[PDB]
């Protein structure tokens, strides 16, 4: 209010846009809220228009602190690719079904391997003492093939017998508008919001 | 869209900052140069600020043209909300 | 004791948006963050109360220390 | 059995997956090559120098085989370097890896990408001059830390940022993954160390006892302890279960800017500013010599694969050789023995570097010292 | 058990899968993980809740049996329950293991 | 210090979990990774 | 040299840009304590736009910044983003050339060398030849 | 008896399919024109009365125990089934069969 | 310069000021266009060397003496 063209006015009035493009402290605790601090100084008694006024002060405190938690949980709400005058670039996460692929792939061969090595640890013409694994073991792996037929019939027998966005704000939000602002930027505040 | 608009008009604009100078300072940020267009609109950012100074300060001078003092950059960014330093040491 | 009710911080965010929910832990570190402005505010009006030589702590003195230091600039 | 060894599963460390039981397949083949470097066979060093780097170089990171090589620079971005003649390529993107198949026997090889092969990759993302860098043992996952506060994890197969680490708001002075790969710790200017584990976004264990800056973090060989050295002169070994300090190791004049373990895990070296590498027991937590021939701030020490030589590189741009078994030969309640003030009998030998600090110093498999600092012409 | 995926509540579910994967907000290769989801849900539910038991006199007409599922048709059975008495014609009776 | 080691030791009196055989690359929820599609404007 | 040359050349450009944004103005002849304060305001504010809107897309899991991070970012700063194209349609405007590089004069000469005695077997091909 | 299965059992899919979604990313909205959608097909069926609707032939599905078969006569003991008769649905966790062929 | 709000460069090194005490405080506008720029460096690259063959440090220029 003190500079006409000051930096942070134009801030939050194209915030405001951007969020619509997508307090009021009770006065009785307040009250005492404030003069047991003002016994550490010799405050003894305080005006009746300052209990209001940091209520009033407390509310632009919070909603410049709601307002910019807003237009960071909104950031993340904006889908690319609905729009196609945006074009994918690099996408990690599709490398990341197929290495889910991989891996399932993977166990089967270490399912296979530990199959091989019971079957050698007594291979003879006839099952041998205790290592004959092969004999039991691979039956009931031909129990588990005949489960998952199971998995195909329960699949067949049905089918026989048949025939606005709510935006949700994080404690990343939260951080993420603390760092920035000069004040709770070195805080034991947002330091402990880092294990929260 | 106007801006997505301008941002596609970019590619075959050539700005007052080089490339190689903006993005220079993105890279020191961590902002590596993906597409030159978004260096470009944000080369343009920054000479927009500096002009936008700059022609305030004129005026000041053209009330009190030609030299920029640091007494016309004063009342220019005061404003602003930025209080400039005199040097005073030197 | 607590000074924000938690109701009336809900409709803080509904006047900005009609259509988000906070979190829990978000909703209580906003509240432990109004608790920490009341309390700095109020330290320091009452440093500049001291300073004025006055055991009233009147406005003057709140209003002093966010334009100073906050830059809030709230009408008085 | 070894009676001071720790159970297997005492620290939830991860499993052997055959991928990295193939690499410790061939990295016997480099054990049988493996010379005994003693005081007789002294190493060979080969000073890998950063000649231009007007950025200011701040970290190197070797992998365990001498295969890549990271720069952490002050113009906040992280350089990996292929050593070997074989560049460094990106695995192909999402759209050509569903038109191969796996199960493949070439899997790995069908994976990489062509297109991208250079001997030189940049890594942009950090706000600040990064302060650590620490490979994985798997040769993925670089490690990064700066100035910014944030711990940062780059792949080395899409050579891309995966997570950002941001625990503290204070410069991270240094990282380093564990040795067997999922844990890492990190030390900043908040006086503190955390334990990572690469899939949590808060830190497990927060080490909390230091009084000035943790500037090193350097994990047991067992990686159940953790070594964090500090400004406040101390030495602080940390268990990983429970986050209590175990060891507390004082005598340093200035802060520790260097630790290395022993590969028997039975020693400790530690470097600082004074230029004196003090050589410490770790079971029965009591300095074990001194080694007192640097003049600046040790910077970087190593034994090495056999634990026959300990290297300590620093500002002074020397790079001595210590006797890493005549130091070790005898093994209280008085808490302290009466050290020798046998550093002339232990110096192997000094090899000063062209106006160049030795900022990093790595033992091949093979016992070949590898050094790595940019040229400074001051 | 796969099974349960031929009720109405897995008519429901189904349809509204379609429904939704019509409109592009969700995607295959997760629906798999919805009905999956869903079908451990009710595996865990239908044997915990309900508590209550039924019991008919049949005269069965062709039964089948083929990978642990029988089949089975009745005709003009009757149910029983305390004070509830249900006539139908013609019934079909899928059960698994 | 005295904040520093309330926190500590409620951080460091929680085990250390166990570990999944074979999750694949460990890492974070995808919340809190910097792996996303990341996309461009087409050039036209 | 060349270390001072590694910063001076990015800020003489920023410096240059000054001089040419001030003469577009009006002024001719300026103080000189004026002018490396206003590169010194426009070298903070490239670096502002680079931290944030890192930040801006990094909140939102992505690593490299698109329209949408950016014009967040500047209304953050408040910019008024409408005013911007008008601004890059001028008649007035200059370009300044970006500082030369002696990286085109990257390598002035490579060679090779023999009579390098052999390589030890804990020594592999790779790492450089003994020499004479 | 069965709305309040088919509540809970949908909750309980919902409450679990919640952090299924949200680590296959998408927004919450999707997962509540899911429930939404869903309850709408409850309300099309027409066939049990519940919330949602305030705001072909006769089958038996269940598990078995055993089937046992005498020369004329069958014993089904069958368990935990939805059965669907005359229109309306029933939900039981017992049954004893006995079925003259 | 300090910004009371610190929005627009916020926690942002420009670098400081390039004055001097011996400088000449005016100058003119069309000088610092006409000069001509400095040379870009060259980039960092990896050079390896021997500092010791078997304990001998050898001749060679990337060596001191």
């Not at chain 5, 079908?39 to 007409?61: C, E, H, P, T, Y």
């Not at chain 5, 083929?66 to 139908?88: G, S």
């Not at chain 7, 002024?27 to 426009?42: D, G, I, N």
């Not at chain 9, 000069?35 to 001191?64: F, M, Y």
């Given at each position: ?11 939050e ?7 619509n ?15 047991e601090?003002?016994?550490?100084h010799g405050?003894?008694?305080?005006h009746?228009?300052v ?8 509310q ?16 993340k709400?904006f889908?690319?690719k ?16 197929f ?37 039991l ?10 489960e998952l037929?199971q ?24 951080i993420f ?7 709770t930027?070195?805080?034991?505040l947002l ?6 | 869209?106007?801006?997505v ?5 970019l ?22 140069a ?18 936008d100074?700059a ?10 043209k030609?030299?920029l003092?640091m ?20 | 004791?607590?000074?924000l ?37 109020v ?11 006055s ?9 002093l ?9 709230i009408?008085? | 059995?070894d ?8 620290i939830?460390?991860p ?8 690499d ?23 000073f ?9 170089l701040?970290a ?35 759209s ?11 899997v ?15 890594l ?5 001059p ?28 899409t ?9 503290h ?7 380093q ?12 200017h908040?006086?503190?160390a955390?334990?990572?584990?690469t ?8 080490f ?12 047991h060989?067992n ?27 004082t ?11 022993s ?33 600046d ?6 034994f090495?694969?056999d ?7 620093s500002?002074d ?20 023995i ?20 030795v ?12 050094a ?6 001051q | ?16 899968l379609?429904?939704?994967?019509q409109?592009?907000?969700?995607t ?7 009905l ?39 005709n003009?059975?009757?149910?029983r ?17 | ?5 309330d926190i ?26 910097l792996?996303?599609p ?7 | ?9 990015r800020r003489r ?8 944004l001030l ?5 001719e ?17 490239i670096?502002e ?13 992505r ?32 370009v300044?050339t ?5 990286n ?29 | 008896?069965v ?5 809970s059992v ?10 299924i ?6 927004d ?16 099309q069926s ?29 014993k089904?003991h ?9 229109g ?9 069969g006995?079925?003259?062929? | ?16 000021r ?18 001509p720029?400095?040379?870009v ?6 050079k390896?060397?021997?500092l010791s063959?078997?304990?001998?440090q050898?001749a ?6």
């Amino acid at each position: 209010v003190a500079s006409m063209a000051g930096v942070n006015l134009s801030e939050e009035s194209a915030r405001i846009l951007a969020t619509n493009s997508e307090t009021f402290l009770l006065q009785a605790p307040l009250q005492r809220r404030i003069l047991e601090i003002g016994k550490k100084h010799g405050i003894t008694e305080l005006h009746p228009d300052v209990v209001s006024y940091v209520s009033h002060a407390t509310q632009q405190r919070l909603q410049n602190l709601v307002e910019k938690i807003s237009e960071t949980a909104q950031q993340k709400n904006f889908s690319y690719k609905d729009d196609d005058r945006y074009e994918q670039a690099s996408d990690v996460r599709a490398q990341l079904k197929f290495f889910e692929q991989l891996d399932q792939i993977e166990k089967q061969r270490k399912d296979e391997q530990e199959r091989e090595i019971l079957m050698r640890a007594a291979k003879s013409r006839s099952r041998q003492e205790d290592p004959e694994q092969l004999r039991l073991k691979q039956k009931a792996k031909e129990m588990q093939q005949q489960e998952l037929a199971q998995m195909r019939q329960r699949d067949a027998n049905l089918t026989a017998l048949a025939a606005q966005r709510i935006t949700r704000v994080n404690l990343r939000d939260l951080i993420f508008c603390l760092e920035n602002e000069r004040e709770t930027s070195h805080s034991l505040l947002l330091y402990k919001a880092f294990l929260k | 869209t106007p801006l997505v608009d301008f941002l596609m008009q970019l590619e075959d604009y050539t700005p007052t900052i080089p490339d190689a100078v903006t993005g220079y300072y993105l890279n020191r940020a961590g902002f590596e140069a993906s597409d030159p267009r978004i260096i470009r609109l944000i080369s343009l950012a920054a000479q927009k600020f500096i002009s936008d100074i700059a022609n305030d300060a004129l005026q000041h001078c053209k009330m009190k043209k030609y030299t920029l003092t640091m007494e016309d950059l004063t009342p220019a960014l005061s404003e602003y909300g930025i209080n400039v330093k005199k040097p005073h040491y030197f | 004791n607590q000074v924000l009710t938690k109701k009336k911080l809900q409709d803080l965010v509904r006047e900005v948006d009609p259509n988000e929910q906070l979190d829990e832990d978000v909703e209580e570190m906003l509240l432990q963050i109004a608790d920490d402005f009341i309390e700095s505010v109020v330290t320091a009006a009452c440093q500049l109360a001291r300073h004025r030589k006055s055991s009233t702590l009147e406005v003057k003195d709140v209003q002093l220390h966010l334009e100073r230091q906050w830059n809030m600039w709230i009408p008085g | 059995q070894d009676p001071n060894a720790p159970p297997q599963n005492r620290i939830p460390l991860p499993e052997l997956k055959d991928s990295d039981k193939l690499d410790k397949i061939m990295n016997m083949k480099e054990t049988t090559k493996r010379v005994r470097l003693g005081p007789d066979c002294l190493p060979s060093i080969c000073f890998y120098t950063f000649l231009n780097a007007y950025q200011g170089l701040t970290a190197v990171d070797v992998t365990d085989d001498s295969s890549l090589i990271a720069g952490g620079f002050a113009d906040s971005t992280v350089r990996v370097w292929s050593v070997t003649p074989k560049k460094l390529r990106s695995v192909k993107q999402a759209s050509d890896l569903s038109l191969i198949d796996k199960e493949s026997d070439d899997v790995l090889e069908r994976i990489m990408d062509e297109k991208t092969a250079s001997e030189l990759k940049i890594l942009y993302g950090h706000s600040g001059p990064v302060y650590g860098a620490s490979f994985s043992p798997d040769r993925n996952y670089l490690l990064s830390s700066s100035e910014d506060g944030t711990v940062r994890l780059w792949s080395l197969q899409t050579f891309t940022c995966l997570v950002g680490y941001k625990g503290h708001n204070y410069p991270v002075w240094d990282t380093q993954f564990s040795p067997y790969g999922y844990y890492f710790v990190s030390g900043g200017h908040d006086r503190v160390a955390r334990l990572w584990a690469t899939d949590h976004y808060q830190p497990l264990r927060i080490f909390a006892g230091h009084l000035a800056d943790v500037n090193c973090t350097r994990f047991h060989p067992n990686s159940n302890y953790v070594a964090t050295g500090s400004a406040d002169r101390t030495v602080r070994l940390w268990d990983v279960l429970n986050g209590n300090c175990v060891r507390i190791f004082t005598g340093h004049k200035g802060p520790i800017h260097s630790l290395t373990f022993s590969p028997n895990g039975r020693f400790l070296a530690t470097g600082a500013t004074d230029g004196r590498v003090l050589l410490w027991d770790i079971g029965h937590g009591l300095m074990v010599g001194e080694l007192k021939g640097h003049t600046d701030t040790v910077c970087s020490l190593r034994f090495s694969r056999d634990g026959e030589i300990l290297a300590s590189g620093s500002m002074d741009n020397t790079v001595r050789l210590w006797d890493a078994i005549k130091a070790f030969e005898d093994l209280t309640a008085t808490g302290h023995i009466n050290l020798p003030e046998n550093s002339q009998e232990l110096l192997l030998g000094t090899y000063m570097t062209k106006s160049t600090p030795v900022v990093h110093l790595h033992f091949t498999r093979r016992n070949l010292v590898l050094a790595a600092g940019a040229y400074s012409p001051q | 058990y796969q099974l349960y995926r031929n009720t109405t509540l897995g008519n429901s579910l189904q349809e509204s899968l379609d429904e939704l994967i019509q409109s592009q907000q969700i995607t295959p290769q997760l629906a798999l993980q919805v009905l999956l989801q869903f079908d451990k849900a009710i595996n865990a539910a239908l044997a915990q809740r309900v508590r209550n038991r039924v019991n008919f006199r049949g005269s069965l007409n062709t039964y089948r049996f083929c990978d642990n599922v029988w089949t089975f048709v009745l005709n003009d059975v009757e149910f029983r329950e305390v004070t509830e008495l249900i006539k139908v014609d013609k019934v079909k009776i899928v059960a698994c293991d | 210090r005295d904040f520093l080691l309330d926190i500590a030791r409620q951080r460091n009196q929680t085990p250390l979990p166990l570990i999944k055989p074979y999750s694949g690359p460990r890492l974070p929820p995808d919340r809190y990774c910097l792996t996303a599609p990341n996309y461009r404007l087409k050039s036209l | 040299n060349p270390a001072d040359n590694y910063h001076l050349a990015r800020r003489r450009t920023l410096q240059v840009v000054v001089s040419s944004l001030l003469t577009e103005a009006g002024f001719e002849s300026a103080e000189k304590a004026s002018v490396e304060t206003l590169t010194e305001m426009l070298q903070s504010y490239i670096s502002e736009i680079g931290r944030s809107a890192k930040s801006y897309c990094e909140h939102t899991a992505r690593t490299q910044p698109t329209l949408s991070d950016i014009v967040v970012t500047l209304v953050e700063m408040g910019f008024n983003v409408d005013t911007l194209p008008a601004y890059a349609k001028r008649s007035q405007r200059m370009v300044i050339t970006a500082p030369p590089v002696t990286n085109q004069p990257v390598t002035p000469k490579a060679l090779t060398a023999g009579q390098n005695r052999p390589h030890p077997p804990h020594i592999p091909s790779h790492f450089p030849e003994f020499p004479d | 008896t069965v709305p309040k299965l088919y509540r809970s059992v949908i909750e309980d899919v919902i409450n679990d399919v919640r952090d299924i979604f949200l680590d296959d990313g998408v927004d919450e909205q999707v997962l509540m024109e899911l429930k939404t959608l869903w309850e709408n097909k409850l309300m099309q069926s027409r066939a049990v009365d519940g919330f949602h609707s305030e705001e072909t032939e006769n089958v038996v599905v269940c598990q078995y125990d055993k089937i046992h078969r005498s020369k004329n006569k069958w014993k089904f003991h069958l368990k935990d089934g939805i059965m669907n008769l005359n229109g309306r649905d029933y939900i039981f966790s017992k049954a004893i069969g006995d079925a003259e062929w | 310069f300090h910004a009371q709000e610190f929005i627009p460069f916020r926690f942002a090194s420009g670098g400081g000021r390039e004055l001097y005490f011996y400088e000449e405080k005016e100058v003119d506008l069309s000088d610092i266009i006409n000069t001509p720029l400095p040379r870009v460096p060259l980039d960092v690259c990896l050079k390896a060397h021997w500092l010791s063959i078997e304990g001998c440090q050898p001749a060679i220029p990337e060596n001191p003496p």
